[PDB]
C-alpha cells in the first residue's frame, strides 16, 4: 500500500495522481496543486505548480488516460513561480491558451513580478507565456459542458484569482472550489500596512476574504494542498470528509486572524 504524501512536502515531491470527486482530478506533486478537469469536448487544466513541474503535470495527466494535446484552456490560481512555473510548458504540450487577469499580465510575459507583488525579492524567474486571453475578474473558461467561474482574489498577490465549477458522479453533484491563497506572506521590505506604497491593496484584500468566505463550497482545495487538510480528505491518509460546506468559510476566517497577526507585526517594527 502507498503511504501518500506529507504535509511539509517538498514542492516538487512527486504524488501518484488521483480522482478528486467525479471529473476533477489531481495531477499536480506533494506539495502543490494542479487539478484536470474532463469531458470528451477538452479538458481544462488548473495551475502549474513549480518551473520544474512542467513533466510531472503531464506524466500525471497520460496516467490518468488523459492526453495533454485534449487540454483547451489553462487558468491558473495566482503569478508566483510555484504556481505559474510551468505554465509555458504547458501550453507547448497542450497547444491551449492560458487564461489571465489583468493585473498578473505583464508577470506572466516577464518570467518576473514587479513591486506590486509582496514577494518581488523573494521571486524566482520563469519562462514567459506567449499566448494569453486576458480574463475579466467574473469571467468564465468553457471548454464543451465545462464552466469555470473566476473569482478575482487579489491580496497574496495583485493578480490572483479563484475557481469554481460543479462536478458530478451521477446525479450527486458538488461545488468545487480551488480558492487562492490567502497568506500575508511577503519578502523582508513589503509592508501591507504602508497604503501610501500601493493604495487599496490591503483593503482588496480584506475584501477578497469576505468573498472567499461566502462561496457556496462543497469541495475546497488550495494551491498548497496543506492549507485546505487535502491529504486528510484524498489519499492514503484520509480521515476526514471530502465535503465540507463550512471549509470556504474557516479557510477565510483563519487567513483574516492571520492577516490581522501580520498587521500586528508590522506595528512592533519601524
Ligand atoms: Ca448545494
Ligand atoms: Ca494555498
Ligand atoms: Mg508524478
Ligand atoms: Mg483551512
Ligand atoms: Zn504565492
Ligand atoms: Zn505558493
Same mark, same amino acid.
Given at each position: /500500500?502507498?503511504?501518500?504524501?506529507?504535509?511539509?512536502?517538498?514542492?516538487?515531491?512527486?504524488?501518484?495522481?488521483?480522482?478528486? %470527486?467525479?471529473?476533477?482530478?489531481?495531477?499536480?506533486?506533494?506539495?502543490?496543486?494542479?487539478?484536470?478537469?474532463?469531458?470528451? /469536448?477538452?479538458?481544462?487544466?488548473?495551475?502549474?505548480?513549480?518551473?520544474?513541474?512542467?513533466?510531472?503535470?503531464?506524466?500525471?495527466?497520460?496516467?490518468?488516460?488523459?492526453?495533454?494535446?485534449?487540454?483547451?484552456?489553462?487558468?491558473?490560481? $495566482?503569478?508566483?513561480?510555484? $504556481?505559474?512555473?510551468?505554465?509555458?510548458?504547458?501550453?507547448?504540450?497542450?497547444?491551449?491558451?492560458?487564461?489571465?487577469?489583468?493585473?498578473?499580465?505583464?508577470?506572466?510575459?516577464?518570467?518576473?513580478?514587479?513591486?506590486?507583488?509582496?514577494?518581488?525579492?523573494?521571486?524566482?524567474?520563469?519562462?514567459?507565456?506567449?499566448?494569453?486571453?486576458?480574463?475579466?475578474?467574473?469571467?468564465?473558461?468553457?471548454?464543451?459542458?465545462?464552466?469555470?467561474?473566476?473569482?478575482?482574489?487579489?491580496?497574496?498577490?495583485?493578480?490572483?484569482?479563484?475557481?469554481?465549477?460543479?462536478?458530478?458522479?451521477?446525479?450527486?453533484?458538488?461545488?468545487?472550489? %480551488?480558492?487562492?491563497?490567502?497568506?500575508?506572506?511577503?519578502?523582508?521590505?513589503?509592508? %501591507?500596512?504602508?497604503?501610501?506604497?500601493?493604495?487599496?491593496?490591503?483593503?482588496?484584500?480584506?475584501?477578497? =476574504?469576505?468573498?472567499? /468566505?461566502?462561496?457556496?463550497?462543497?469541495?475546497?482545495?488550495?494551491? $498548497?494542498?496543506?492549507?485546505?487538510? =487535502?491529504?486528510?480528505?484524498?489519499?492514503?491518509?484520509?480521515?476526514?470528509?471530502?465535503?465540507?460546506?463550512?471549509?470556504?468559510?474557516?479557510?477565510?476566517?483563519?487567513?483574516?486572524?492571520? =492577516?490581522?497577526?501580520?498587521?500586528?507585526?508590522?506595528?512592533?517594527?519601524?
Amino acid at each position: /500500500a502507498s503511504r501518500g504524501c506529507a504535509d511539509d512536502a517538498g514542492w516538487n515531491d512527486p504524488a501518484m495522481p488521483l480522482k478528486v %470527486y467525479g471529473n476533477t482530478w489531481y495531477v499536480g506533486t506533494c506539495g502543490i496543486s494542479a487539478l484536470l478537469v474532463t469531458s470528451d /469536448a477538452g479538458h481544462i487544466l488548473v495551475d502549474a505548480a513549480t518551473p520544474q513541474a512542467g513533466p510531472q503535470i503531464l506524466a500525471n495527466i497520460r496516467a490518468l488516460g488523459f492526453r495533454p494535446e485534449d487540454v483547451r484552456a489553462i487558468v491558473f490560481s $495566482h503569478e508566483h513561480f510555484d $504556481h505559474a512555473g510551468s505554465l509555458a510548458e504547458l501550453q507547448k504540450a497542450t497547444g491551449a491558451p492560458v487564461y489571465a487577469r489583468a493585473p498578473a499580465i505583464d508577470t506572466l510575459k516577464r518570467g518576473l513580478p514587479d513591486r506590486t507583488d509582496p514577494n518581488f525579492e523573494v521571486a524566482e524567474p520563469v519562462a514567459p507565456v506567449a499566448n494569453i486571453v486576458t480574463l475579466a475578474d467574473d469571467g468564465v473558461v468553457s471548454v464543451g459542458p465545462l464552466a469555470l467561474t473566476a473569482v478575482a482574489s487579489p491580496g497574496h498577490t495583485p493578480g490572483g484569482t479563484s475557481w469554481t465549477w460543479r462536478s458530478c458522479e451521477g446525479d450527486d453533484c458538488r461545488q468545487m472550489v %480551488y480558492a487562492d491563497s490567502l497568506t500575508a506572506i511577503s519578502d523582508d521590505v513589503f509592508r %501591507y500596512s504602508d497604503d501610501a506604497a500601493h493604495p487599496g491593496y490591503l483593503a482588496a484584500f480584506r475584501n477578497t =476574504l469576505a468573498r472567499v /468566505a461566502a462561496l457556496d463550497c462543497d469541495i475546497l482545495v488550495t494551491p $498548497h494542498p496543506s492549507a485546505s487538510g =487535502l491529504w486528510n480528505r484524498i489519499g492514503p491518509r484520509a480521515a476526514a470528509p471530502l465535503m465540507d460546506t463550512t471549509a470556504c468559510r474557516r479557510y477565510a476566517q483563519g487567513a483574516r486572524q492571520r =492577516l490581522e497577526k501580520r498587521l500586528a507585526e508590522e506595528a512592533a517594527t519601524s
